[PDB]
Amino acid sequence: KREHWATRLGLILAMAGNAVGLGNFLRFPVQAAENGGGAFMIPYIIAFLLVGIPLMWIEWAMGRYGGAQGHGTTPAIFYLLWRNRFAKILGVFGLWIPLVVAIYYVYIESWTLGFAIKFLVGLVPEPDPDSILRPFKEFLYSYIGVPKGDEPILKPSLFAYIVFLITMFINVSILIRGISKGIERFAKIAMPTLFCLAVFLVIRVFLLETPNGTAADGLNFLWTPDFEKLKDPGVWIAAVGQIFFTLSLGFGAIITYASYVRKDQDIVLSGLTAATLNEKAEVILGGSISIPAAVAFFGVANAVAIAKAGAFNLGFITLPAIFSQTAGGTFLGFLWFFLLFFAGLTSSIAIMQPMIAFLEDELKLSRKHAVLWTAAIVFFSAHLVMFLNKSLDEMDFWAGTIGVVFFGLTELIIFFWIFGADKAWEEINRGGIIKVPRIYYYVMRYITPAFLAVLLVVTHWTVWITRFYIIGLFLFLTFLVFLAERRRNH
Amino acid sequence: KREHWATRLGLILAMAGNAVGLGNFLRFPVQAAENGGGAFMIPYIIAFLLVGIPLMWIEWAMGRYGGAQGHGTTPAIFYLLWRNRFAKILGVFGLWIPLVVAIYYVYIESWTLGFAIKFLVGLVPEPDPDSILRPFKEFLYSYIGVPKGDEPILKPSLFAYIVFLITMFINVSILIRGISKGIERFAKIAMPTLFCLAVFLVIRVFLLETPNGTAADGLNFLWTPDFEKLKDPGVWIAAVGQIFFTLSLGFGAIITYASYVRKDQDIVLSGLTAATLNEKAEVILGGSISIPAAVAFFGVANAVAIAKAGAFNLGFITLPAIFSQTAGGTFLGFLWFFLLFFAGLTSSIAIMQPMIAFLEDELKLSRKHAVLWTAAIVFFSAHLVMFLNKSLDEMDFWAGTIGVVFFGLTELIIFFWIFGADKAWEEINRGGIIKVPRIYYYVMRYITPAFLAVLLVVTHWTVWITRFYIIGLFLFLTFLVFLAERRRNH
Ligand SMILES: CCCCCCCCO[C@@H]1O[C@H](CO)[C@@H](O)[C@H](O)[C@H]1O
Numbered sequence: 001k002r003e004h005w006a007t008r009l010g011l012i013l014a015m016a017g018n019a020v021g022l023g024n025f026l027r028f029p030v031q032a033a034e035n036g037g038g039a040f041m042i043p044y045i046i047a048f049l050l051v052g053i054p055l056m057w058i059e060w061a062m063g064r065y066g067g068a069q070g071h072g073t074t075p076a077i078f079y080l081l082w083r084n085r086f087a088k089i090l091g092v093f094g095l096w097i098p099l100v101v102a103i104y105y106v107y108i109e110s111w112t113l114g115f116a117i118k119f120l121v122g123l124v125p126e127p128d129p130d131s132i133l134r135p136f137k138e139f140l141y142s143y144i145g146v147p148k149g150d151e152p153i154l155k156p157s158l159f160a161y162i163v164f165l166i167t168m169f170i171n172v173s174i175l176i177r178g179i180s181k182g183i184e185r186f187a188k189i190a191m192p193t194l195f196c197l198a199v200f201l202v203i204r205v206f207l208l209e210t211p212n213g214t215a216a217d218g219l220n221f222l223w224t225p226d227f228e229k230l231k232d233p234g235v236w237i238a239a240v241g242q243i244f245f246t247l248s249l250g251f252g253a254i255i256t257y258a259s260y261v262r263k264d265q266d267i268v269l270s271g272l273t274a275a276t277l278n279e280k281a282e283v284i285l286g287g288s289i290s291i292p293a294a295v296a297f298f299g300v301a302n303a304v305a306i307a308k309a310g311a312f313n314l315g316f317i318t319l320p321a322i323f324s325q326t327a328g329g330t331f332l333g334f335l336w337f338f339l340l341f342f343a344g345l346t347s348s349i350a351i352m353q354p355m356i357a358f359l360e361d362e363l364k365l366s367r368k369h370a371v372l373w374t375a376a377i378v379f380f381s382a383h384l385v386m387f388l389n390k391s392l393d394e395m396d397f398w399a400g401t402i403g404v405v406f407f408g409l410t411e412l413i414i415f416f417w418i419f420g421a422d423k424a425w426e427e428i429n430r431g432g433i434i435k436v437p438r439i440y441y442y443v444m445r446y447i448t449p450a451f452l453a454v455l456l457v458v459t460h461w462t463v464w465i466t467r468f469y470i471i472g473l474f475l476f477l478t479f480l481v482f483l484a485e486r487r488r489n490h
Numbered sequence: 491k492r493e494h495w496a497t498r499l500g501l502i503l504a505m506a507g508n509a510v511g512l513g514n515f516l517r518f519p520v521q522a523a524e525n526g527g528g529a530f531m532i533p534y535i536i537a538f539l540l541v542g543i544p545l546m547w548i549e550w551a552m553g554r555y556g557g558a559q560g561h562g563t564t565p566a567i568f569y570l571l572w573r574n575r576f577a578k579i580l581g582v583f584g585l586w587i588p589l590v591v592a593i594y595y596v597y598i599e600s601w602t603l604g605f606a607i608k609f610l611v612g613l614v615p616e617p618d619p620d621s622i623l624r625p626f627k628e629f630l631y632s633y634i635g636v637p638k639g640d641e642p643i644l645k646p647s648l649f650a651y652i653v654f655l656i657t658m659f660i661n662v663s664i665l666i667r668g669i670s671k672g673i674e675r676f677a678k679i680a681m682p683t684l685f686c687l688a689v690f691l692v693i694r695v696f697l698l699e700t701p702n703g704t705a706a707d708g709l710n711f712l713w714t715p716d717f718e719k720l721k722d723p724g725v726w727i728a729a730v731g732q733i734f735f736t737l738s739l740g741f742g743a744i745i746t747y748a749s750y751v752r753k754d755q756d757i758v759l760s761g762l763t764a765a766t767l768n769e770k771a772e773v774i775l776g777g778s779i780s781i782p783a784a785v786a787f788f789g790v791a792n793a794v795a796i797a798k799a800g801a802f803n804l805g806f807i808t809l810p811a812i813f814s815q816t817a818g819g820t821f822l823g824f825l826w827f828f829l830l831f832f833a834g835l836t837s838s839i840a841i842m843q844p845m846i847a848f849l850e851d852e853l854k855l856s857r858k859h860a861v862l863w864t865a866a867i868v869f870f871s872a873h874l875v876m877f878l879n880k881s882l883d884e885m886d887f888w889a890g891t892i893g894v895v896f897f898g899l900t901e902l903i904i905f906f907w908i909f910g911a912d913k914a915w916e917e918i919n920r921g922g923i924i925k926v927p928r929i930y931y932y933v934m935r936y937i938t939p940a941f942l943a944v945l946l947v948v949t950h951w952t953v954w955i956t957r958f959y960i961i962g963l964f965l966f967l968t969f970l971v972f973l974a975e976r977r978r979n980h
């Protein structure tokens with residue numbers, strides 16, 4: 001009647017791979033560097049405690065609950081908790097967000113496979129600072145085809161394109177095998193390899209020393225409070241957006257994975273362990289690679305200005321430029337890209353599974369066909385992100401930034417207010433190997449929803465191409481929900 | 491088990507309204523004027539005899555045949571005639587073409603409602619020739635929002651937009667009532683009003699006389715052979731493309747309408763009468779309004795240069811400019827626009843019904859829901875045509891020009907070669923009130939397919955926005971076919 005995680009360890013490593021992704025190694029460092037370093041960290045830690053943890057529990061509980069009744073996605077699950085047609089509609093966001101995010105994230109992930117291939121085989125640039133960074137800027141710019149003139153059009157390289165195809169093939173070959181034999185098996189290999197590669201890279205970074213500094217200066221920058229910044233709302237917004245992204249909250253992905261957890265299996269400890277594994281990967285591992293390397297070679301002020309330059313400057317340009325000045329630096333680049341790739345891959349399979357679970361659960365497609373149609377929608381749609389300059393940024397904003405925070409508050413209200421605070425509490429704790437601390441009941445019912453509602457309260461014409469397409473996506477998925485509900489009646 | 495046309499007269503007037511549309515009054519005159527006048531007419535007449543007539547019969551026969559088995563659209567019907575999965579796929583064109591065409595045609599139709607409203611109420615320009623034409627050029631340009639600078643972006647007026655909404659509401663209110671009570675009832679009112687308004691307009695045009703000419707000079711220009719041009723392939727291509735457009739061949743619309751014809755009711759005479767009613771409306775009525783008026787005021791050479799200027803110059807700019815120089819010219823403009831509107835409306839409901847019939851027949855939606863989802867897809871998608879300069883031209887090319895000729899040859903091969911020439915023949919003639927002339931058997935099996943295969947053998951970066959979207963449409967409809975075939979299995 002339903003697929004199930006085979007083992008507790010597999011469960012937890014799958015969920016950890018869901019969370020531990022590009023957010024940890026690329027987004028975190030830039031977010032932290034742009035927002036004062038340790039000035040970012042206080043709100044980040046508070047957000048983890050007031051949003052992260054409690055939404056994680058709530059999403060596992062929603063998933064396990066839907067899964068016991070044969071439903072893994074939010075159009076059905078929201079309706080099970082609130083019997084109103086509007087529940088189904090709000091529910092479409094938890095298919096739309098992950099699909100929209102999958103569209104650009106799988107492409108960025110393919111970049112890491114491509115750069116990994118090129119770094120391994122040594123087809124890389126050979127290098128004044130601008131004189132060292134420029135060939136790496138050009139190498140990224142040719143790969144993705146950054147516009148050279150006024151037209152907002154991208155020309156990715158043939159190699160970029162084919163590597164996107166291979167990346168899709170790889171996602172598909174894991175997903176097509178299912179939960180236990182696909183995602184779970186694969187997490188048990190990927191997560192230890194990922195942890196080992198990151199540890200190696202931190203160790204190697206910790207030894208960098210130049211006339212402008214050492215790695216320790218980067219660790220000081222990141223872990224040193226600046227209580228002046230606690231007053232700035234932007235830091236708080238940045239901190240909470242990062243918490244959501246990094247924990248996969250509000251993307252419907254945690255829910256969908258929890259729907260393969262057996263009805264009475266614990267979610268309290270398992271939920272907290274996944275969350276905690278992600279935070280360690282983010283702040284110890286992701287926090288100790290990029291910022292420290294950048295600071296050791298350029299000093300703080302220049303590392304910050306680099307972070308501010310682009311989402312991708314640090315990870316795809318600067319870090320390999322820095323590695324190129326060290327013995328075996330091209331192979332270190334390889335290992336960094338290969339780290340990003342398995343990090344991406346364990347996350348992208350998590351953000352495709354919701355659309356798969358919808359097609360299997362609500363429309364009764366076989367797994368084969370659900371995975372293939374999903375790959376086809378994501379592949380097709382990614383042509384927008386590959387060819388239209390700033391389409392990616394637009395999707396990341398509506399779905400990956402705003403959308404997720406909105407959807408997180410929505411699922412909280414649906415589960416904890418409408419369905420019932422006490423019934424939600426009970427459902428979270430049922431089968432617990434530990435119980436949720438009792439103060440969290442008040443955090444979930446009052447603090448988390450207030451925190452988020454407060455935050456929420458506080459371009460070129462081609463953006464409309466992207467808005468139009470991703471609104472069309474929402475209408476298409478709303479239509480599929482409609483068909484699913486008409487298949488129930490027959 | 492199926493909706494049926496109530497009456498033979500209603501049947502024929504519905505099919506005549508399917509055919510008799512904007513093609514007759516706007517496209518024909520421009521096609522004919524651009525291609526030498528009577529130089530166009532010889533190939534046009536030959537195409538009517540070798541493509542028009544025989545494809546009309548074939549499409550009615552395919553429709554009646556599918557309809558007896560509960561299927562009105564080509565994914566199912568192609569499969570019934572050729573039991574191969576590839577038949578279903580080719581079949582998607584006969585949902586995709588009409589949907590794509592509906593997207594831009596309904597918008598152009600809304601223009602006619604808007605101009606009709608403005609002309610009736612006198613909110614029109616008041617007017618050297620350029621001094622008379624320019625205010626009408628501006629009035630069209632503001633209405634649709636033609637770009638004023640370098641960006642390929644349209645800014646339709648608020649009034650244009652709301653009138654598009656009303657136009658959609660009107661299409662919907664006919665379609666939602668069904669075949670007999672909606673399309674059929676409405677054709678019995680619209681077609682006599684349309685014929686009366688056109689006759690009035692021809693009479694009024696026939697009286698125009700200026701120093702540069704009379705209406706008769708325009709009739710001479712159109713009906714005078716130029717045997718030099720018979721050698722030019724472009725004239726032949728133009729002539730055949732017009733035949734398809736004007737008869738609605740290759741848009742899946744004739745088929746879908748024929749699928750509501752009772753199994754043993756005649757299609758030979760009915761088919762020929764519809765075809766013949768359309769040709770008379772095209773060459774006597776559409777041919778005697780615009781070209782003669784234009785020639786009487788400007789002389790032939792200037793009328794030709796006007797035709798060549800744009801698809802819409804003649805009908806939306808020049809003709810009202812000319813009417814403005816005559817007593818009661820603003821009301822004559824109204825009657826012209828109102829003529830175009832009912833002409834459009836009787837055709838656009840025909841090109842939405844295929845998607846409706848698919849949703850009812852293959853996915854079992856009620857009529858209400860099938861009409862509403864269809865209106866929603868068309869409304870949504872039309873934002874591309876409303877806002878992206880030359881998107882309309884792009885859709886008209888792929889679907890309305892190439893697509894239809896390709897699809898016409900495809901349905902011919904499927905029905906007359908694969909299924910069986912003799913079985914096709916028999917199926918066409920069964921229930922005939924007359925029989926198809928026997929020479930036509932050879933035309934259909936050999937001449938029509940050769941003619942079309944021979945013809946078939948013989949921009950700005952934003953075109954890719956439109957190509958991308960309408961390829962996405964094809965994939966979406968292919969997916970719906972897939973769901974439909976999986977609903978059969980369950
Ligand atoms: C512009 C956004 C639309 C998405 C689909 C783009 C289709 C690709 O378009 C094509 O790209 C190729 C490689 O750059 C080239 O062969 C062609 O010159 C170009 O037209």
Ligand SMILES: CCCCCCCCO[C@@H]1O[C@H](CO)[C@@H](O)[C@H](O)[C@H]1O
Pocket residue numbers: 155156157158161380383
């Ligand atoms: C299958 C979906 C079709 C949509 C059109 C996409 C066509 C992709 O086009 C490909 O892009 C590559 C990357 O720039 C180019 O290098 C290749 O030359 C080009 O063939």
Ligand SMILES: CCCCCCCCO[C@@H]1O[C@H](CO)[C@@H](O)[C@H](O)[C@H]1O
Pocket residue numbers: 049050436437438439440443
């Ligand atoms: C934002 C909320 C911060 C959460 C920190 C909670 C840490 C656990 O707090 C503990 O909870 C136990 C179990 O209910 C109590 O018995 C203990 O007295 C208490 O220390």
Ligand SMILES: CCCCCCCCO[C@@H]1O[C@H](CO)[C@@H](O)[C@H](O)[C@H]1O
Pocket residue numbers: 461464465468643644645646873874877878
């Ligand atoms: C550009 C093609 C995308 C299709 C959707 C376009 C959405 C409309 O976009 C909006 O148009 C309005 C009227 O012109 C204005 O209010 C706004 O300035 C504009 O952003």
Ligand SMILES: CCCCCCCCO[C@@H]1O[C@H](CO)[C@@H](O)[C@H](O)[C@H]1O
Pocket residue numbers: 645646647648651870873
């Ligand atoms: C419901 C589908 C939403 C897609 C965005 C379309 C927004 C339409 O936008 C409307 O366009 C009119 C015509 O230019 C403008 O005059 C109006 O000011 C504007 O509100």
Ligand SMILES: CCCCCCCCO[C@@H]1O[C@H](CO)[C@@H](O)[C@H](O)[C@H]1O
Pocket residue numbers: 539540926927928929930933
């Ligand atoms: C491109 C083909 C032109 C079609 C013109 C056919 C006109 C009808 O032709 C007639 O067909 C009758 C019935 O089969 C025959 O009995 C007659 O001898 C013949 O004149």
Ligand SMILES: *SCC1=CC(C)(C)N(O)C1(C)C
Pocket residue numbers: 195196197199200
């Ligand atoms: S996790 C063990 C491990 C593997 C390898 C990549 C060789 N390493 O440097 C460590 C010690 C991290």
Ligand SMILES: *SCC1=CC(C)(C)N(O)C1(C)C
Pocket residue numbers: 685686687689690
């Ligand atoms: S079809 C009868 C008719 C009505 C009207 C519009 C008044 N006319 O001018 C004619 C005679 C065409």
Ligand SMILES: CC(C)C[C@H](N)C(=O)O
Pocket residue numbers: 018019020021022023024101105245246247248251253347348350351
């Ligand atoms: C979209 C999510 C799967 C992202 C993931 N939690 C990451 O940090 O990269």
Ligand SMILES: CC(C)C[C@H](N)C(=O)O
Pocket residue numbers: 508509510511512513514591595735736737738741743837838840841
């Ligand atoms: C697309 C078709 C309904 C067009 C119609 N035959 C016309 O001439 O306008």
Ligand SMILES: [Cl-]
Pocket residue numbers: 142143157159160
């Ligand atoms: Cl490359």
Ligand SMILES: [Cl-]
Pocket residue numbers: 632633647649650
């Ligand atoms: Cl206007």
Ligand code: NA
Pocket residue numbers: 019020021023024245246247248278282
């Ligand atoms: Na993460």
Ligand code: NA
Pocket residue numbers: 016017018019020021022342343344345346347348
């Ligand atoms: Na991951």
Ligand code: NA
Pocket residue numbers: 509510511513514735736737738768772
């Ligand atoms: Na016509």
Ligand code: NA
Pocket residue numbers: 506507508509510511512832833834835836837838
């Ligand atoms: Na019509």
